[PDB]
Design an enzyme around this catalytic site. Structure first.
Site, PDB file in Angstrom:
ATOM      1  CG  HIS A   1       2.092   6.791   6.474  1.00 39.73           C
ATOM      2  ND1 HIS A   1       3.493   5.898   5.961  1.00 39.73           N
ATOM      3  CD2 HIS A   1       2.736   7.706   7.332  1.00 39.73           C
ATOM      4  CE1 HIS A   1       4.528   6.479   6.364  1.00 39.73           C
ATOM      5  NE2 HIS A   1       4.280   7.629   7.164  1.00 39.73           N
ATOM      6  CG  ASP A   2       2.191   2.621   4.540  1.00 43.28           C
ATOM      7  OD1 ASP A   2       1.101   2.370   3.796  1.00 43.28           O
ATOM      8  OD2 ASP A   2       2.789   3.644   4.019  1.00 43.28           O
TER       9      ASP A   2
ATOM     10  N   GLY B   1       5.397   5.929  10.800  1.00 41.32           N
ATOM     11  CA  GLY B   1       4.867   5.080   9.554  1.00 41.32           C
ATOM     12  C   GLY B   1       5.509   3.802   9.570  1.00 41.32           C
TER      13      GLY B   1
END
Ligand code: U21
Ligand code: U21
Ligand code: U21
Lengths: 262, 262, 262
Positions: C125-126, C143
């Protein structure tokens, strides 16, 4: 039998004899063997293989390309009807493998509840994973490994056969655990060595200031005192009769067979 | 052609031109390309992709999510009709990848017989794996790597391009091999360094007391004597004319291009 | 809508609302969600899962058992409609995972163009991956990680959350990156430490002799001078007004939050 409220995708193959609970979801291209039990509300996203004598609890989420209940990688295994048990509310991510036990090792691979098993985490034959654990990407357990409650295994980390990872332990990423890790401790390296108490984890899980101090003192008895383990075990037991959280150490010592990481 | 006694699941896609042998089993959701040969009694469990110019022998077990014969990861590769060869009685576990060769590297990726390739083991383009080998979880071979008979690659371990892992070698888990590993030796670390002879492996494989001693003496010539490799090669050759097991060293030296791990 | 010139295999499941571009190929047993956009000429080989709010560009090759746009592994994520963006001409290999962002981290996971993501590479994620990058087998980003243009992450290597891997960096295999890596540098180890400038990479990418020298001098200011980063930043800025390639350092410094690997 498949419960009337369960969804089974037309492309999924659920073999006769399988038990599928209420409001369970079996996604596209999944395969479910005849000796599998899948609990209420459990979701198999897609492309999931579940076979062997395998019981899965409630509200689990099992992601694509995971293999649950499969034949283990122990060359000693010969096709015996061994078992997998998986509890409730687990998140079992892409490519995770959880293998059936061996007769030699007790016949059972067990995983508790509320665990997060990240991408390509591996639970070998005869392992016991407790509750609230985290196995990060590529975290790999060899056979007969115990991972106790709340324990965290970092990314790319491997655990040697028969080792115990104690309750509330944090094992750092890119590590190799070759011996037993006492509860509450931070472990890192290859081979992994102890780096104090998992203070932050205990704080977040509601442990009192007094309990954490007692645990730190127990750590110091084991690692700082310079005394043997046999010398400090009764001292830890005495400390435990005031602070019950310290009892985790004595319970761990009785199970430990590999010696402690030092 | 597909043999009359072979099973092909209705959901499997076996493309016209593929050769499937007697009593072979092609499980659900498998894909088999037109230039693939699958030998007698070989089982593809489910969700297996086999493509390219790929020959697979007899009594193999290939597990779900494995990719066999696929386009390699070498940026130099341009879609040329290169090859994979796989022998007999191999156990090829979940998510294993075995990639086709490159024209530049000889056009062939080869795997022998009776090997165990554990979860997510990777055999890159132009690799040669012998017989009776074990690649543990996440064991990763870069291009043009040789893994000789009985050699074991530990979990989470990577081998650098063009390296040779000698016969009967045991490479420890969580390691990184950057140079050639002589036969019979234990290797561990990153970068991997030698830790004596694989005595236990040789004992179990029926090597005589005399042979193991001779191998240990050859190891000592290489690593303990303090002499150069060119100095000890004729000495190893002399030792080999009494103990034929020592000939493995001289055969290895002729192939070695990366230098020895030290 | 699915373009008239796109191929969708009868066994593939493309959910209503999905956008499939001209001459795209959706292979057997693929699943494509209703909020997915797949660009012109992009190929999903087989057994690919693409879901979430996910935009994929042109001429991509996505291999079997890959999971693109999936729910991330951040315990903070709660099912919010976050996003994945993937550019053009990427090669996304078997078992690669690219996860959607989190609201907390900006809502977007981004991958640029002409990247090679090898087997079981993980984009959490991200994350933001630039252009022309290589993530080797099992390369794992936690992340919020940035991997800048031309950067290479070696096999079995993990990058700690929030870290930046600078442009033209080469991170060695079997490594663990815990802090920010300046552009143009070689990094290796666990934790990873700097080993000079990626001279060979720069040479191959058309960097002038003068530019490489200037970059080496900037490296020496950071690591050899013995001065603080705040002392050398204006000196690097002065050097950059003659050699514009050095501006990569100052742009990197403004983004860096983890401190530099040393
Ligand atoms: C840590 C990261 C590695 C990845 C972990 C994931 C793998 C697991 O799913 C499987 C597993 O751990 O099974 C083993 C099982 O937990 C153990 C106890 O029951 O038994 C086995 O391991 P063990 O260490 O006891 O190996 P063996 O004694 O059975 O011998 C296997 C091979 O090693 C060779 N060997 C052994 C010892 C030695 O010193 N040198 C050798 O070459 C021997 O010749 C033979 O070819 C089992 N292995 C095999 C290959 O059978
Ligand atoms: C060890 C664990 C890693 C995982 C192993 C699994 C990967 C294999 O399946 C694939 C593989 O090993 O292929 C390579 C092939 O075995 C080799 C020889 O034939 O050639 C290649 O490796 P090599 O070391 O020669 O790299 P290149 O010289 O082809 O350059 C590739 C990239 O590295 C950059 N580079 C090179 C050298 C340097 O010093 N700095 C750089 O930045 C260069 O700019 C370019 O972008 C091949 N690679 C690529 C990416 O093409
Ligand atoms: C490097 C190789 C590892 C593999 C990388 C691939 C994993 C990624 O896909 C996922 C990811 O990186 O998400 C994390 C997210 O990037 C980060 C920032 O947003 O937040 C989280 O990581 P973080 O370091 O902040 O962990 P938390 O603070 O959220 O706490 C998670 C667990 O760690 C325990 N903990 C924390 C700190 C400590 O000192 N001791 C602990 O036991 C705590 O009790 C709890 O059970 C996120 N993690 C989790 C498990 O939620």
């Amino acid at each position: 039998m498949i419960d009337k409220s369960a969804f089974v995708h037309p492309t999924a193959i659920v073999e006769e004899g399988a038990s599928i609970g209420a409001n369970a979801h079996i996604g596209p291209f999944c395969i479910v063997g005849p000796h599998v039990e899948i609990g209420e509300g459990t979701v198999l996203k897609s492309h999931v293989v579940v076979n062997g004598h395998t019981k899965i609890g409630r509200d689990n989420e099992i992601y694509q390309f995971a293999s649950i209940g499969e034949v283990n990688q122990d060359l000693k295994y010969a096709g015996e009807p061994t078992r997998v048990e998986i509890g409730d509310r687990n998140r079992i991510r892409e490519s995770v493998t959880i293998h059936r036990g061996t007769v030699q090792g007790g016949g059972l691979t067990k995983v508790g509840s509320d665990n997060l098993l990240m991408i390509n985490a591996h639970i070998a034959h005869d392992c016991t994973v407790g509750n609230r654990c985290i196995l990060a990407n590529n975290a790999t357990l060899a056979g007969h490994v115990s991972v106790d409650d709340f324990a965290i295994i970092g990314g790319m980390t491997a655990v040697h056969q028969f080792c115990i990872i104690g309750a509330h332990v944090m094992v750092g990423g890119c590590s190799g655990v070759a011996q037993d890790v006492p509860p509450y401790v931070i472990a890192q390296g290859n081979h992994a060595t102890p780096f104090g108490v998992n203070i932050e984890g205990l704080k977040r899980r509601g442990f009192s200031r007094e309990a954490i101090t007692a645990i730190r003192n127990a750590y110091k008895l084991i690692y700082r005192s310079g005394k043997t383990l046999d010398e400090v075990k009764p001292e830890i037991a005495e400390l435990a009769e005031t602070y019950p959280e310290v009892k985790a150490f004595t319970d761990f010592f009785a199970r430990s067979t590999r010696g402690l990481i030092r």
